[PDB]
Amino acid sequence: RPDFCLEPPYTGPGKARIIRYFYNAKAGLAQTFVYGGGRAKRNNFKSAEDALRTCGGA
């Protein structure tokens, strides 16, 4: 599994409220989070389906 997939989400310092997806380590689900619009980390997807294709598999 890529090495960023089990990290908590990262809002960053931006002031936007963009609804992105992260792969939730505990649950194994794609979940929404509020992204601030800059300085993303890699557990940050535009859709649930992208989060699962990248992070869902062991």
Short mmCIF file of C-alpha atoms in Angstrom, two decimals:
data_model
loop_
_atom_site.label_atom_id
_atom_site.label_comp_id
_atom_site.label_asym_id
_atom_site.label_seq_id
_atom_site.Cartn_x
_atom_site.Cartn_y
_atom_site.Cartn_z
CA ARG A 1 0.00 0.00 0.00
CA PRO A 2 1.55 3.41 -0.69
CA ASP A 3 3.29 4.89 2.30
CA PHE A 4 1.06 7.92 2.64
CA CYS A 5 -2.27 6.09 2.73
CA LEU A 6 -2.53 5.51 6.53
CA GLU A 7 -1.87 9.11 7.51
CA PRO A 8 -4.48 11.42 8.97
CA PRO A 9 -5.89 14.00 6.53
CA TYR A 10 -4.09 17.31 6.16
CA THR A 11 -6.15 20.51 5.77
CA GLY A 12 -3.11 22.67 5.29
CA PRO A 13 -2.79 26.42 5.87
CA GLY A 14 -5.17 27.51 3.10
CA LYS A 15 -8.49 29.21 3.88
CA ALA A 16 -10.67 27.37 1.36
CA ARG A 17 -13.15 24.68 2.32
CA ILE A 18 -12.79 22.19 -0.53
CA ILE A 19 -14.40 18.80 0.18
CA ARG A 20 -11.74 16.20 -0.60
CA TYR A 21 -11.44 12.51 0.24
CA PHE A 22 -8.91 10.62 2.38
CA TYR A 23 -8.45 6.92 2.93
CA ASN A 24 -9.41 6.28 6.60
CA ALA A 25 -6.87 3.78 7.98
CA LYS A 26 -9.02 2.42 10.81
CA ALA A 27 -12.22 1.92 8.85
CA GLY A 28 -10.94 1.15 5.41
CA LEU A 29 -13.35 3.66 3.86
CA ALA A 30 -12.90 6.72 1.74
CA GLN A 31 -14.10 9.72 3.83
CA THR A 32 -14.62 13.38 3.17
CA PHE A 33 -12.51 16.07 4.81
CA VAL A 34 -12.13 19.82 4.50
CA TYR A 35 -9.05 20.87 2.47
CA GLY A 36 -7.79 24.41 2.58
CA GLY A 37 -6.64 24.66 -1.00
CA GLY A 38 -2.86 24.53 -0.67
CA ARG A 39 0.09 22.44 0.38
CA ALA A 40 -1.68 19.09 0.09
CA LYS A 41 -0.32 15.82 1.37
CA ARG A 42 -0.78 12.67 -0.69
CA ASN A 43 -3.77 11.15 1.23
CA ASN A 44 -5.97 13.66 -0.56
CA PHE A 45 -8.24 12.70 -3.42
CA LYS A 46 -10.89 14.37 -5.56
CA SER A 47 -13.27 11.40 -5.19
CA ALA A 48 -13.94 8.32 -3.09
CA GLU A 49 -13.21 6.09 -6.05
CA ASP A 50 -9.76 7.60 -6.51
CA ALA A 51 -8.96 7.15 -2.79
CA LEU A 52 -9.87 3.44 -3.04
CA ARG A 53 -8.04 2.78 -6.29
CA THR A 54 -4.86 4.28 -4.89
CA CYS A 55 -5.05 3.37 -1.17
CA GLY A 56 -7.59 0.65 -0.74
CA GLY A 57 -5.46 -2.33 -1.45
CA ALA A 58 -3.01 -3.92 0.84
#
